[PDB]
Each structure stands twice: as structure tokens, then as C-alpha cells.
Amino acid sequence: SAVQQKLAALEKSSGGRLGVALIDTADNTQVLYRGDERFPMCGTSKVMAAAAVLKQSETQKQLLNQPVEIKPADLVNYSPIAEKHVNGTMTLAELSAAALQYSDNTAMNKLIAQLGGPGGVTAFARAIGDETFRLDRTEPTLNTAIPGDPRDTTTPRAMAQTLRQLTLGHALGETQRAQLVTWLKGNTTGAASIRAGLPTSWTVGDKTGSGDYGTTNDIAVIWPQGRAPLVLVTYFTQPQQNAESRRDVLASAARIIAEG
Numbered sequence: 001s002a003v004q005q006k007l008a009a010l011e012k013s014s015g016g017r018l019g020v021a022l023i024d025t026a027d028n029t030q031v032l033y034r035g036d037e038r039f040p041m042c043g044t045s046k047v048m049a050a051a052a053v054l055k056q057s058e059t060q061k062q063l064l065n066q067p068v069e070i071k072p073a074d075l076v077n078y079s080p081i082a083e084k085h086v087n088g089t090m091t092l093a094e095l096s097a098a099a100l101q102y103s104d105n106t107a108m109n110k111l112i113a114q115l116g117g118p119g120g121v122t123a124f125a126r127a128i129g130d131e132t133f134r135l136d137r138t139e140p141t142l143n144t145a146i147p148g149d150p151r152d153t154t155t156p157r158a159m160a161q162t163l164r165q166l167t168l169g170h171a172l173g174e175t176q177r178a179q180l181v182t183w184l185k186g187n188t189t190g191a192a193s194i195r196a197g198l199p200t201s202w203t204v205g206d207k208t209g210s211g212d213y214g215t216t217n218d219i220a221v222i223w224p225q226g227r228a229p230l231v232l233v234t235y236f237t238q239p240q241q242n243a244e245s246r247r248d249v250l251a252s253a254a255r256i257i258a259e260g
């Protein structure tokens with residue numbers, strides 16, 4: 001298709017490897033580019049962790065209000081919210097919002113621990129029908145994004161399907177889904193990624209990720225006014241371990257999708 005030709009040209013211009021999956025919920029049509037290749041998820045994996053804790057809260061009614069200690073030894077790099085509460089506590093709701101809206105890495109580690117380890121996050125993915133997602137490590141090493149490494153990867157096709165089930169479908173209870181949607185719409189890290197390529201009248205909830213090899217990721221649910229919502233995954237990674245981030249590639253992929 002012509003959208004695929006434009007995505008391939010964007011990828012050729014970028015020097016890296018681009019993965020795109022679009023679901024148009026109006027007719028369940030999809031656009032895939034490298035849609036079955038694995039990509040390092042980096043922080044886009046935090047959506048699965050927050051969702052798995054929300055699922056637990058369907059039976060543990062007050063789980064989101066449970067305090068969790070933030071100790072000095074817990075603090076890993078890029079933890080701007082948790083660092084403010086060292087030697088104090090944050091609730092699981094606050095940790096979920098921090099992991100999702102600021103990509104706080106310590107917050108993610110608290111979600112992983114609540115689930116019993118990385119295997120607990122993968123377990124939730126399998127429980128909702130995602131056979132592809134795998135979380136293998138904690139923060140910060142899950143972002144090493146080593147070429148070919150299957151650890152901490154998924155495919156664009158699988159992550160788009162999962163993000164649809166979590167936000168627009170019924171993988172979660174009604175109030176849990178609404179809470180996840182609120183958190184994603186309130187993300188603070190996404191202005192230069194998918195959001196930057198879309199008409200500004202469209203409502204967007206998204207979660208970014210970044211890692212070594214210039215890995216630059218974003219997954220989004222998109223509400224245009226007057227049409228059914230879309231789900232868009234944009235994954236990007238590069239050959240050089242010290243490559244710069246390329247959020248412009250993600251914005252440009254979104255702009256191409258919105259044109260088609």
C-alpha cells in the first residue's frame with residue numbers, strides 16, 4: 001500500500017528499524033510495518049505492568065491505596081517521582097501514575113515486585129491472550145535493547161492488539177479500564193512522539209519508551225472527533241549502541257498513518 005511505501009521511505013531515510021501497527025476500530029482494519037518483528041519494549045512495557053496491578057485490584061478493592069516504601073536502595077536512574085518520596089511511601093495508584101506519566105523506573109520496579117517479579121507481568125499478558133509479550137528483567141536493565149535479544153520484547157501487531165483490549169476492550173473491568181485511560185491521557189513524556197504527528201483536535205493517551213541503540217518507542221490510543229478510535233504502536237531502534245533518540249521518526253510515522 002501507499003502508506004506502507006511512505007513508512008518504508010521514512011525508515012530508509014532514518015537509518016534504523018521501524019515497526020508500526022495501526023488498528024482502526026471503525027472496521028478492524030490494520031496497517032502493519034514489520035508488524036511481526038520483535039522490538040525492545042523499554043518503557044512501553046510499563047502499560048502491561050500497570051494494567052496487571054489494576055487487574056489485581058478488581059478483587060483486592062483497596063489495592064491501589066496500599067502504601068509502598070521507597071527506600072534509598074530502591075532508587076534507580078530516571079525516577080523523578082519516587083526520588084521525591086525517599087524514606088516515605090507512595091500508594092500503588094501513585095506508583096502506577098508515576099510509571100506511566102513520567103516513565104519513573106523505580107515506580108515500575110514497585111509494580112513488578114507487586115506482581116511477583118517480571119514473570120508476573122508476562123503472566124498477565126498471557127491471561128489476556130497476548131502470546132508474544134515477554135518481560136524478563138527489572139529496571140533499568142530491561143532497556144538494554146541489544147540487537148536480536150528476545151528479552152523484554154514484543155511485536156507491533158501484538159502490542160496494538162493488547163493496547164486495544166486494555167483500553168477499548170474488556171481485558172480489564174470497567175472502572176479499571178477508565179483509570180488506565182485517564183493515566184494514559186495524562187502522560188507528560190509524549191509531546192514529541194506520536195502526539196506531534198497528529199491533528200491537535202484528536203485526544204491521545206500514550207506511553208513512551210527509550211533505551212540504548214537509540215531505541216525510541218511510543219504506543220497510543222487515539223480518539224479523533226467524529227470517528228471511531230484508533231490504536232497505534234510505533235517502535236524504532238538503531239544500529240549504534242550510543243545512537244541519539246529519534247522521536248521525530250515516531251511523529252512522522254503517526255503523521256503518515258493519519259494521512260492514509
Ligand SMILES: C=C1CS[C@H]([C@H](NC(=O)/C(=N/OC)c2csc(N)n2)C(=O)O)N=C1C(=O)O
Nearest residue numbers: 042043078103140143144189208209210211212
Ligand atoms: C523519559 C524516559 C527516559 S527513562 C524511561 C526508561 N528508559 C531508560 O531508563 C533508558 N533510557 O535510555 C534513553 C535506559 C535504561 S538502561 C538504558 N541503556 N537506557 C524507559 O524506557 O522506561 N523512559 C523514558 C521514556 O521514553 O518514556
